[PDB]
């Protein structure tokens, strides 16, 4: 399903073109602006290890997930991927460990060398 679809069909949005972050737009957003470093960004997300174990979602907290883009508050892949999204867009990202939690991982939630999958909906973003 979704992770394999991104493997097969996703755009490589990395500067190095190492397939570290692959993206499919699932629902098109509105407007010309995309988030820039420093912006406060508001999202809903569903995430999981690509091996389907551990499913984490903002809905569990009954509240949007808010972060500042580029401020080291989220994994590199989010900084890269959310900067490509329009307001209202829903996208799927598939992420190699070098753009997430690497060889160390982040136990107990994230093992070493983990590939991650997210669905992200961009709700809003505001300038610092
Ligand atoms: C490695 O630790 C975790 C990883 C992830 C979630 C974690 C977490 O423990 C802190 O808590 C979820 C609760 C929520 C309100 N929240 C989100 C963050 N901190 N608290 C942000 C923490 C860092 O997360 C990220 O950079 C990414 C993108 C933003 C959304 C959360 N992310 C995760 O890596 C998830 C992880 C997704 C894959 C399945 C397991 C959880």
Swiss-Prot record:
Domain PPIase FKBP-type span(s) in chain numbering: 30-118
Task: State where the protein is found.
Answer: Cytoplasm; Nucleus
Q: List the disulfide bonds.
A: none
Give tissue specificity per the record.
Widely expressed, enriched in testis compared to other tissues.
Q: Which residues carry this modification: N6-acetyllysine?
A: 16
Modification after translation: Acetylation impairs ability to promote interaction between Akt/AKT1 and PHLPP1. Deacetylation by SIRT7 promotes interaction between Akt/AKT1 and PHLPP1, leading to suppress Akt/AKT1 activation.
Signal peptide interval: none
Q: What induces it?
A: By androgen.
Q: Quaternary arrangement and interactors, per the entry?
A: Part of a heteromultimeric cytoplasmic complex with HSP90AA1, HSPA1A/HSPA1B and steroid receptors. Upon ligand binding dissociates from the complex and FKBP4 takes its place. Interacts with functionally mature heterooligomeric progesterone receptor complexes along with HSP90 and TEBP. Interacts with NR3C1. Interacts with Akt/AKT1 and PHLPP1; enhancing dephosphorylation and subsequent activation of Akt/AKT1. Interacts with IFI44L; this interaction modulates the kinase activity of IKBKB and IKBKE. Interacts with IKBKB and IKBKE.
Give the protein's biological function.
Answer: Immunophilin protein with PPIase and co-chaperone activities. Component of unligated steroid receptors heterocomplexes through interaction with heat-shock protein 90 (HSP90). Plays a role in the intracellular trafficking of heterooligomeric forms of steroid hormone receptors maintaining the complex into the cytoplasm when unliganded. Acts as a regulator of Akt/AKT1 activity by promoting the interaction between Akt/AKT1 and PHLPP1, thereby enhancing dephosphorylation and subsequent activation of Akt/AKT1.
Instruction: Return the protein name.
Output: Peptidyl-prolyl cis-trans isomerase FKBP5
Which gene name does the record give? Answer: FKBP5
């Amino acid at each position: 399903g979704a992770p394999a679809t991104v493997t097969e069909q996703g755009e490589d949005i990395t500067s190095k073109k190492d397939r570290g972050v692959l993206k499919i737009v699932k629902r098109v957003g509105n407007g010309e602006e995309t988030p820039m470093i420093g912006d406060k960004v508001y999202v809903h997300y569903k995430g999981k290890l690509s091996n389907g174990k551990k499913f984490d979602s903002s809905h569990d907290r009954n509240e949007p997930f808010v972060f500042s883009l580029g401020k080291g508050q989220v994994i590199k892949a989010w900084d890269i991927g959310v900067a490509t999204m329009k307001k209202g867009e829903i996208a799927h990202l598939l992420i190699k460990p070098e753009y997430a939690y690497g060889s160390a991982g982040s136990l107990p939630k994230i093992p070493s060398n983990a590939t991650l999958f997210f669905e992200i909906e961009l709700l809003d973003f505001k300038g610092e």
